[PDB]
Structure formats: C-alpha cells, structure tokens
Amino acid sequence: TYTLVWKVWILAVTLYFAIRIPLTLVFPSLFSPLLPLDILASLALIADIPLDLLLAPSRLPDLLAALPLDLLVFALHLPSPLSLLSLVRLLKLISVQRSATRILSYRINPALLRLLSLVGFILLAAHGIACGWMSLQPPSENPAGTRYLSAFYWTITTLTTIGYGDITPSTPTQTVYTIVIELLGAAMYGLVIGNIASLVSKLDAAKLLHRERVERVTAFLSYKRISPELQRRIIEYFDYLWETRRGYEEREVLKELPHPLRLAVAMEIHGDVIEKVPLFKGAGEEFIRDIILHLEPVIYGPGEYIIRAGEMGSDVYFINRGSVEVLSADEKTRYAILSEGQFFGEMALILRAPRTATVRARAFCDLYRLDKETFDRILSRYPEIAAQIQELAVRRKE
Amino acid sequence: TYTLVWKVWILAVTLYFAIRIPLTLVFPSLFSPLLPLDILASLALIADIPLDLLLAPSRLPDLLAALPLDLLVFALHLPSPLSLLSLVRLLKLISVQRSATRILSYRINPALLRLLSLVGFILLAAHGIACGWMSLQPPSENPAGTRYLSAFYWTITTLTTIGYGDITPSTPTQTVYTIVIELLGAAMYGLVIGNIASLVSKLDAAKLLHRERVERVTAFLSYKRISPELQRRIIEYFDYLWETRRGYEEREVLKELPHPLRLAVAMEIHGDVIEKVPLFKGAGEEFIRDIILHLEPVIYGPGEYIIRAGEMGSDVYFINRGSVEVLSADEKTRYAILSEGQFFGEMALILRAPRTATVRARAFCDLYRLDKETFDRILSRYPEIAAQIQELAVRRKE
Amino acid sequence: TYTLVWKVWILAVTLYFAIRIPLTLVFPSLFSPLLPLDILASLALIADIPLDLLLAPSRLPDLLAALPLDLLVFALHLPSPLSLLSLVRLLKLISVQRSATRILSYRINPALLRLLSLVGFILLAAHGIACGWMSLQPPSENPAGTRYLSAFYWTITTLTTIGYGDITPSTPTQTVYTIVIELLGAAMYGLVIGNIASLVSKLDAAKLLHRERVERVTAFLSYKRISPELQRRIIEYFDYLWETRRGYEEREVLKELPHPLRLAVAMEIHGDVIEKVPLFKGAGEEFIRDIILHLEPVIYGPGEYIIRAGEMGSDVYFINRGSVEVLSADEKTRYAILSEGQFFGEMALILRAPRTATVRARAFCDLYRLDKETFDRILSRYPEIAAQIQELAVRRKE
Amino acid sequence: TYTLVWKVWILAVTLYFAIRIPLTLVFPSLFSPLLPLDILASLALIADIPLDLLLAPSRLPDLLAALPLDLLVFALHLPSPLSLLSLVRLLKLISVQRSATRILSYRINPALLRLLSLVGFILLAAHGIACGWMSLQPPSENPAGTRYLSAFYWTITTLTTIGYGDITPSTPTQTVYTIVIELLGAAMYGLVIGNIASLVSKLDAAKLLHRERVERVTAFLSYKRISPELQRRIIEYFDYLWETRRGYEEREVLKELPHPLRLAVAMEIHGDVIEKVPLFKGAGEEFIRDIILHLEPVIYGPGEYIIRAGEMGSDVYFINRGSVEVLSADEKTRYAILSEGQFFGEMALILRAPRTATVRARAFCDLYRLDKETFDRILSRYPEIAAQIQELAVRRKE
Numbered sequence A, B, C, D: 001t002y003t004l005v006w007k008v009w010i011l012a013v014t015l016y017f018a019i020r021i022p023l024t025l026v027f028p029s030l031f032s033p034l035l036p037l038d039i040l041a042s043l044a045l046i047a048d049i050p051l052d053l054l055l056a057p058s059r060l061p062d063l064l065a066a067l068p069l070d071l072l073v074f075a076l077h078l079p080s081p082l083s084l085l086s087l088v089r090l091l092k093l094i095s096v097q098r099s100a101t102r103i104l105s106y107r108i109n110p111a112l113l114r115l116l117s118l119v120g121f122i123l124l125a126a127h128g129i130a131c132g133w134m135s136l137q138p139p140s141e142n143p144a145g146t147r148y149l150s151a152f153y154w155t156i157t158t159l160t161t162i163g164y165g166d167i168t169p170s171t172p173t174q175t176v177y178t179i180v181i182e183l184l185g186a187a188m189y190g191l192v193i194g195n196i197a198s199l200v201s202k203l204d205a206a207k208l209l210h211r212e213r214v215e216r217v218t219a220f221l222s223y224k225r226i227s228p229e230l231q232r233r234i235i236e237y238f239d240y241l242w243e244t245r246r247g248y249e250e251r252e253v254l255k256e257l258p259h260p261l262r263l264a265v266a267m268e269i270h271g272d273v274i275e276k277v278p279l280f281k282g283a284g285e286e287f288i289r290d291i292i293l294h295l296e297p298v299i300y301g302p303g304e305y306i307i308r309a310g311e312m313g314s315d316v317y318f319i320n321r322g323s324v325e326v327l328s329a330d331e332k333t334r335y336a337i338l339s340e341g342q343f344f345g346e347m348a349l350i351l352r353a354p355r356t357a358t359v360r361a362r363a364f365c366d367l368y369r370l371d372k373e374t375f376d377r378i379l380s381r382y383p384e385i386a387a388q389i390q391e392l393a394v395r396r397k398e
C-alpha cells in the first residue's frame, strides 16, 4: 500500500490546486501567505514522472501540469488575458481520474464511480465558474465572504436550470458569459440526467437481474391462476436461491474465463464437496480436475419426487446440504434417510437396472447432477474408484 | 393476514412520525396536546423486535429508531443544534420500505412500486425541507397556515427546477440552505426522470414485448408489399395469440424453473387436455408426467393445409379447440370433421405408411405437436396404450 | 372504410367536447348559441354502443361518457363544486385512444404514435389547466382573449418547468392549485423526456440496427489497420445490402411466424426465382413448398472466388442477379459467363467428382445456397427432376 | 479527395445562408453590400445537381433550395408575410447533413455525430429564433449589437428551460411566439437529453463492453471470497486482454461478414503466424485458406498447466508470443523451452499415444487451438505436410 498514500496525496494536491488558482485569479491579494504550500505542491507535481512505474499522445497532461507556470504569473503581475495561462494545472484532473479508475479496493461500480467523478467535476466546475463570474463584476466594498457566496449561489442556480432571476447579468460582457455557462449548464445537467438514468440499473446488478427474472415468471403464473400452494412453494424456492447463490447461475459467469482460471475457480468453490464426500478424500490430484467442472448443482423442494420407481434414470446425485429419504415399492416403508456426504442412484449404470424405489427430499436438498457419460468415462479411466463404487453398490443390495 | 394489519399500522405510525417531528421542531408550541399519540407510537416502535419473526450491519435502523429520543428533547427544551438529534425516527423509513417490498398481494411491478416509493419519499422530503426552510426565517406575526403554505410552495418550486423567483433567500444562512436543497432537488429530479425513463418499458411487460415483436415483422412484410390477404390473416393470427396466450411462448418462461416445479406447472396448465382426451382419462399417474412436458401447442388459420398427401410426416397432432376436416385424394370428398378430443395422423408411425389424405383446419385449431421419438418411447414403454392406438388406427382403416 | 369516417367523427366530437366543457365552466355566458352542436354531439355519443361491433371492467367509460350529464348542469345553473361533474365526457379519451391504436393504415411506430398521443394529451391538459386557473381568478374587466391568452401562457410556462415568474399566484387558494399543477407538470415533463429517450431508437428500427451492426465491425477492422482496398469492398458490400434488403436477414424475422404463414411469405417473396429458373417453370405445386424455404441468399463481391478447383464442395448455387464466369485449370481460359437463370456446381453430388474448374463472379451476384441433404432428398423423392439434372450435367460434360 | 473540398464548400455556403437570411429579414438595411457573396452562393447552389454523381420523393430539397427565391424578395421589397418565402434555403440543411453522414474519414460514432449535428441544429435554430423575436419588437434607437445580444440571450434562456424572467413578452403577438418557442424548447431539450442518455453507452463501445463484462465476474468472484492470488492473476489476464485485443473476441465480430470477406480478414490478421511457422513458409495458396479460419487464439498465465501427463488431448497448440517449457514424468527435469515458431503435442494424433510429459507456459503465451478433426482432414488431404509432421515427431522422439 506504499502507492495508495502517494495517490491520495496527489489527489489532494491536485484538488487543492483546482480549488486554489482561480480563487487567486479573482483575488490577487492572496498567494502572499501560501507560498510554502505552493512550493511543496510544485515539488510534488514534478516528482511523479519517475515514481509512477516519455512524451506520449495520452501522457502529455502530466508534463503539461508539472511545468511551474504557477508561482510566476502572480509574481510578475501579468495582465489577466496573459496570466490566464496558469490554469494548466487543471489538466492533472484527467490523470488523477484515470489513476483512481485503475486502482480500487472495494471494486466500486463503474457507473456509480463515474457519477461520483461527475459530481466532483461539476462541483469543481461550479467553483471555477463562480470565481470567473466574480472576476468580471463591478468593483464594490463587500467582504469576500458575501461576495463569493452570492456568486456561487448564482452559478449553482444556472447550472441547475432553476433560474430564480434575483441576480442577473447587466452588461454585455456579462451577458456573453451568462450564455456560455447556460449552454454548459444544459450540457452538464444532461450528462447528469443520463448518468442517473443509466445507473438505476447498474448498482447491485444481481439484485436487479434476479428481480426482473422472477417478476415475469410470477406475473405469467399468477395470470394462469394456478393453485396458490404452488405459488407459495415456487416463491419459497426463488427466495432460497436469493439467499444461497444471490440469484446466480454458475454458467452465466464462468463461460467467459479461459480453461485454467475456470478450473481454479471451480476448485476454490467446490473444495467443500471435495472435502466431505467419502471416496473424494484425497482421491487424486488429477481426478478432481476432471470431475469438478461437471457437477451441476440442482435444488429441490420439501417433498418433491427426486426419482420415481420404474424410471431409467442413469445419473448419480450427490448431497451437499439436506436429508433425503427413499420410499420403497409399498409406498409406506422407508429404508433410511440420506444426509450430507453420501449419494444415491449408484445402482443405475453399473448394474443396468431400473430404479428400485422412489426417492424424495425432506426440506431443501442441494444436489450435484452428474451426467452418465462423465460417470462412464471416470469408471473406464479410474479402476479403484469403480471397484469402490461397486463395493458400496453391492453393500446397499444386501 | 395477522401481519398485514401490523405492517399497515407500522407504516402509518412511521409516516405519522416523519410528518410530525420536524413540524414541531419549527413549532415548539405543539407536542403539548399530542402526548398520548406519541406515547402509543413509542410503545409500538419498541414493540416490533420480538414480533417481526440482534445487532446486525443491516438491522441496526430498527433499534436506532425504537430508542425514545423523542418525547425527551422537547421535554428538556434542548437547543436546536442539540435537539436536532430527534430525527433518528426517520431511519425507520428504510425498514418499512423493505418490509413493504417483501410483502405483496397484487404483485406490483418493482419499477412502478419503486416510483411510488420515490414519490412518497420526495413528498416526505418536500415536507421536511419546507419545515426546515420555515425554521430559519425571520420572526413574523403570521398564522401557521399561510406561513407553512408559502414554505411548501417554495420547496416544491425549487425541487421541481421551476424557480419562479417570487420568494428567494435574502440572508447568507438562507443562501447556503438554498444551495444545498438546489443540489438535492437536481439529484431528486434526476432520479425521478430516470425512474420514468426506465418504467415506460416495465409496466405490463408482455403488452409491450408482444407489440415490439409484432411491429418489426409487420414493417418488413409490408415493405415487401406482399398480398394484403396474407397481411389480414397474419394480423388475425397475431391478435388471436394476443387474446389467447397474451403474446407468450411457454418456453420463454418455463426454461428457468427446475424440473419438478416445471412438471407441476405443466400439469396445472394442461389438466384440460388431460381431462378430455379419450385414452388419457386416468391413463396413469406416471405416463402423464412423461408426456405432458413435450406437447408443443401449434396454431393454424382458417383453411391452412395441416398435412398434405404424400408426405412422410410422423407426428401426431392433438385437438384442444377447433374442428378439422380431412380431404381425400379426389380433393372433393371429405371423410368427416374432427372436433375437440380426437387426433389425426396416427397411421404414420405404427403403420409406416405415407399420408393417406390431406387434412385442413376450419377456423382456428389449437393443436399439440408431439415428436416421433417421444411417441416411439411411449409405445415401447406402455403396451396397453399401443394396443389401443393400433385399435383406433385399424378401426379408422375400415 | 365505412368505419374510418365514423372513427374520425367520434375523435372529432370527443376532441370538441374536451376543448369545450371547461371553457364554458369558466365562461357561463356560452352554451347559449351552441345548443345544436351539443345536441348532435350527445346523439353521436349515445349512438356508438350498437355500432361498435354490456357492462365490463374496461368498457365502462363508454357509458360513463355517453350519459347526458352535459346540457343539464348549465341548464339548472348548479354550483361550481356540484356542476363540476360535467367533466365525465373526458373519459371518452381512453376509448378513442384505444380505438385509434387498434386501427391504422400507415402502421405508425407504436412509440412515435404514443408520443403523438402524449403530445395531444398534454396539449389538452394544458388547455384544461389554463381554464381552471382562469376560473379562480379575481374578477376583472378584460376581454376573454387576453384573459385566456395570459392563462394559457402561464400554464405552458409551469408545465415546461421554465417559470419566468412574471405572473405568479397571490392567494392561498391559487397557491395550492399552483403546487398541484407544478407536481403534475414535473410528472408530465418526465413522461415526455422518457418518451423521447425511448423513441430515439424506435423509429426506422432497421435503419438504426443496421448502422449499429456495421459500426462495431468497421471500428474493429479499422483498428486492425488492414488493407484499405478491403475496407472499400467491405463498405461497398454493406451499402449494397442496405440498398437491397435494407440491412435485413430473413431468419431474423421469419423465425417467429408459424409454419404455414412462413411458407406463404416465402412463396410471395421467392416467386421471382420460381418464375425464371428453367426446371422450376411449373415443376410442381408441392415441390416448391418443400424447396422454397431452404434457399439461403448469399452475396459475393466483384471478383471473389466462389468455388476453387480441387475442393469437395457439394452445394448448388442458383443465380438471381448477376453474371458468373468460370476459369479452367489453366487460369487463362474461361468456358462462358453464367447470367441469371442457370446455376453451377451440379456435377458435384450426382457425379461424385471434385470441382473441375474455378468459378468467380463479375460485379455482384445474388445466389441461393442449397444444402447437400436437401438436394439428396429431392433427388430421391422426385425422379424426373433428377433425370433432367443429370441431363444438363452430362450435356455440360460434352 | 476532389469531392471533400466541394462538400466542405457546400457546407460552408449553406451555413452562411442559414445564418444570413433571417438576420436580413429583421435588418433590411443589409443585403446592399453583400451582393457578390450572394451571387456566388446562388451559383454554387444551382451548380451541384450535375456534380453530385431528377425529381424524387427524397431529392426534392436540392431543387427547392437551389431556386433563387433569394436576391429577389429584398430587391422588390415584398411585405414580411409574403417575403417570408425566402427561408426555403434552410431545406438544404437536410441534404448537407445526409451528405456529411455518407462521407467520413475518422468514422465518427453515429450517436456522437448525431449529437454534434443536433448541437449545430439547435445553435442554428437559436439564431433563427433570436432573429424572429427581434423582428416583432417595438422600434428603438439601439445599436444592432446590444439589440441582438439581448435577443439571443433571451432565446438561449427559453430553449434551456432556465427562464430568469428579466426580459419577458409584453404583447399578445409576442406572447403567442413565446408559447410556440417554449414548446419547441421543451422538445429540443428533450431530444438533447435523450441523445446524451443514449450516447453515454455509444462512444468507445469496446471500452464499455469490456468493463461491463469484467465487472460482473469480479463482483461474483469477490463475493465468493476466493484466494486473493487468484484475484490478482485473473485481473492480470483481463488487463492483458484489454491491452492486446482491446477486450475482443474474434467471433463476436466476424460472425456477420460473408465467407470470402471473412477469409480475407482472417488472412490480413493472421499473416504473422503464416509468416513465422516453419512448415507454413509458402506451404500453399489454398492450404492457408482452409486452415487460417480455424485457429482459435487461447491465452494462459505464467505457470499454468497447459496439458498434463496421462491425458488424451489430441489438439496441437501453436505459439505466437511466449516461451513454453515441458516438465517430464519426474517433475524435476525439463527437456527445453519452446519459444515462438514451434508447437507441441504433435505426437498425440499421428502416434495415438498419451501425453508423454507435462507442458507449462512461462509468462503469457498466445496459442492457436486447432481441433482434431481439422488436423485429420489436412493430414488426409495434404500428404507432404503429413510426412514433414511425422518427420519432426519422430525426430522429437529421438
């Protein structure tokens, strides 16, 4: 974090400049007691080119704002049209904005941070415009307080497109300035309106995407006027998904990363099911790499028929959270309850037999769907695991 | 509904507070005759933590607004900067908004309800800002009526970005407040503009999606300048779809729910075709589970050629609404008219024969497309149903 | 068009009412010389229930606006709060808007027509609000002209959120009205802003979709800095597509219509290629139905290698516009030029031989891609066509 | 570029007209010393019909603006309602806008250029409206400077919806004009708001699409709270993609161009890998055409396991940038480092053998994924290349 302090310091110094130079263009009486601050600021502004690790079509602003055009124009008392060149330090704003965009810790939303940057920019521009309006005013015997408060109030009035009209321009040189910043205020307010209009669907993107996905389903299903119990259980499933995965589907996000990053993410996510399954306890460094990407999580409600008897289902379902009970062919007797760690349906592919009994969940079971092809591949590739699987299968037969 | 009344009561009491505290900050003469209401309100505010079924990073506002900072600041007559702490009750707004978001009966559109919440929030903020503006006003001998009406009129003027300018700030302490709420009014108006700009395509989402889908097809087809009779029949089909399914495709909505919820929804929707088809009358608890998801509804116009003679079509079409006639190879003689309940094309897969005669609808027939693979699977899985199907096939031969 | 005149008449009469009733609420001196117009209007308003081919949750406004509450309140000179009931005729606006939405000849864009309806509604509301503001004004000796022009000017000032402030409310009963229509003006201006913000990408949807599709390709390809000749020819192809199909892909629009409408549209579009190809001149009523949906149009530039020698291409390319030349294995000698009507590549599937010579277009050739599977199916289904195709193939061998 | 100068000249002359005619409608004293400019302008306006390579429903404005209605109305001193016809030259604006839309060199963004055109149009309309407002003003002894500056200031006030209210209409003929341009200002400001609201996501579309794609992945992955080293390497991969391909996937853009343009683009992009690979140095004109479209670039991090031992991988990976090392079965000894130019995994399909050793990258390797099917096709189609590949394979065995 040796660069976070430096970046904070550079942001503070560039903000100090952007606040300070116009305020002394209007008020030449300043700049006399603030010389050490300006000296330190100039030193910091020149001392960032070697610390940021030459001329570029995009890295020019750094040198354009490091040159000491300040502390010289006031010193020689140049005329205002010629002393206006001191505003070059305002070009450092682009560089500090880019730097703050390239460094983060919270990972702020790009649209919300863009709106924050626009808020900062419009506040800074409001201060600059207020100072400018104050500059071309008739001389008066007023304190700088009320004289600046009135100017800032007028600038915020025009840039907000409110326009009370209590104070208005009265000279042509003021009228041209009023027109220019009226147009700029229209543009800036338009940019802000567009920024909120875009941002309303950018913050907590999952929280809005899940809501929009649920809304259409609920509307159509309520229009069909289906049984309210089904409504209740569907809404319960959807809010449980909201609580567990935050309205996510894994393939919605992992289908962009390349293969090794995808493998690493899958391992760091499914280390749990790697750690609790009996035959996966140190089964192999490679085997987990082949299998971990294929397990597709499935979610079932409290009492739903997982697999009915007589079916030709050839897929093994693992358990990550929940208890599962199996009901035999007499639909009265249950063999046992299968909590986390075990699975069911093993005697479907190896044994080439139909579903011996109906299996149903209890409250909410997090499963792991595995396709028959992957199961066949791992059985034909790893023999000890196939031997163990047949061992538990023949044990469950007894 | 024992919680709906409680939630309505909590909304009413928090709205009463949000309206009441600032109005007595400006007017200390109140709070003397409204003590029982405040006592009951305080009791209700503390009596919701055990009735909502500890400290949390998101459940803090409940305790922050339950603490009785009210009925004490006015009692001891604290100074205004120190008595300003009584506004903590306004944090209950977040909790009541969240609660109202989590409970519904009409299933209001999230964007429209968000706009309603924003309307309520901006009205409440307008009242608060009006009371605040009234607070820092010069003392005058005016009734509280006109004195509050003028303040609210001014607040609604600034927050709407209209600014007539009949009444304007005249002191620096008023000018700073004017600037602050000018910025807040810009932000709030921007939020409202974004909310309507988003909401214009959120209410009755089907009614707009269907319109947008129809518009491009109609525009292109009219550009091609094809025969107007085809225009008329296409538009008739589209409006019939609007009337029947409200511009919906089943797979557009069912492709997100898991398998058992999808099965349950399919049964609750297609119980009709389950109930009228002759061989589906109590055919089996399981068989309907296998078949009901695959029947794809198809819609044909008044006179369209369903299946022409000589084709190798191997799909059975059911009937849900409408009459279908079959024209023989002499294109003059019709065998009969097939109303709801029966089907056609059975002697295509079992008999391995081509289409014996042309079949056409009459006005608008709702069919049920079934693929050859599913038909083969059910024939090879259920034998009595295959026997019955061959029975009606050989009967129709005679 | 016997209903277009009736709908125009009903729109005219409801607009006349919506303009007329408030203007006589403010001005009671009217309604004396306009009795025949009101009588005819009332007759027309009651005489539409049997001509529109009972009580409904959505068809209530028709009866609510047909009842003659007008011509009675002015007759008995009811008090203003009680005579305010005459505004029920304004509910006919919903019905006329719905009717105009359900009938069209130009097929106006739904968003642009929605904006036109909103423009009409806001103008009508501006007139109503101006009349209302005029109602609660102090009595004065002014002509109704200037007295209404000032009121309408004020109403358009507030609803536009401009607020000059030359004329402002001065009584509490006026101030409440000012606040109410200030809020309504905010809402209406927000709706208008959202409507344009949505409409900017709704008019001539093809003209914008094609532009957006071309822009990304051009930007990326220019970024790669590839040879400018390729830029020129790619842009030429894209503008030719703009001129010919208006930036369309057939499957983008036909993938929503059902099978028979799709067949009919395909026939009405490809009757040209049906009419010019030698072996398609009355080939068969059914054969065109099987083939016409599969021909995929392909577009090639001036000189592009259609099919090179030595390839295993097994697809027949038809010609709809353009000349095609074939270059032999000596890359100097051309057999002929193939204009519209014929095809090439026939001796690829029947003969099971590789591409005998290279074939290239001349300026811009509109082809018709046909897959090998469909060609095989039609050859194995229709024998005379296969005989003819082999006849031209063996002829081209000689 | 013989037409760029002509188009610039026509834009300049039409802008000069649009600025000039209303300014002399208000000020008849002009048009006396500017006759040569108007003569040259008229000549240029008539001399563009034969230089643009008759009557059309869309090409009418050219003739409507070429006719010399100017230099005649002022000459005969027609009355203002009758001399108002001179504004026909403003219809040339549509044609110049269309022409500038059809010709470009920078390939400006259509939305940003549309906003620039709207800015130009609203500025021109502001000038026209200011001149119009100046026209119907009471006569006064004021210089044309202040008299026009005030009018333009007022016009920019109304069209920005600010409305200070320092200068307001005072006559009914002025009030009607004020209402008309108030409505027009509402419409124009709405259009501008919509244009920025759309443009915020149109400039540098790749720069925003890549950011939005990265944001959701980063948010979800940080929510899972996976190991920060994986965060660092994933972010490094994403920024490297930003630097190399600018956040692009080739199939995202090439899946719209037809086959020959796609082939040409692929050759112009992959001429590098064509030029450096040993066996691709002039391998064949056709072979590169078959292979160049299939090579899919893959990117791996510094140390990632490319292909582990014991796998059945049958795909050859080429090298475009980076060094690759292979670790043997003793996981301590490396055979060599494979820099750009060579490949690995050749002895996987020809030899029908499993992966002899583990292969890993070093810093960041740009590969070229080739499917087994394409490799088999080229081996069975080109025999010398297969002989050479087997030669290097058997050499690498030794």
Ligand SMILES: Nc1ncnc2c1ncn2[C@@H]1O[C@@H]2COP(=O)(O)O[C@H]2[C@H]1O
Binding pocket: A307, A326, A335, A336, A343, A344, A345, A346, A347, A348, A354, A355, A356, A357, A358, A359, A396, A397
């Ligand atoms: N005795 C048993 N106790 C618990 N589970 C069992 C028992 N016998 C079988 N099962 C499981 O119940 C499942 C239901 O039928 P399957 O073919 O899916 O595979 C079966 C086994 O996994």
Ligand SMILES: Nc1ncnc2c1ncn2[C@@H]1O[C@@H]2COP(=O)(O)O[C@H]2[C@H]1O
Binding pocket: B307, B326, B335, B336, B343, B344, B345, B346, B347, B348, B354, B355, B356, B357, B358, B359, B396, B397
């Ligand atoms: N005598 C008949 N009466 C009614 N329908 C018939 C008769 N004979 C055949 N059909 C139906 O007409 C259909 C047309 O040919 P298919 O092969 O589709 O299957 C045929 C039967 O379903």
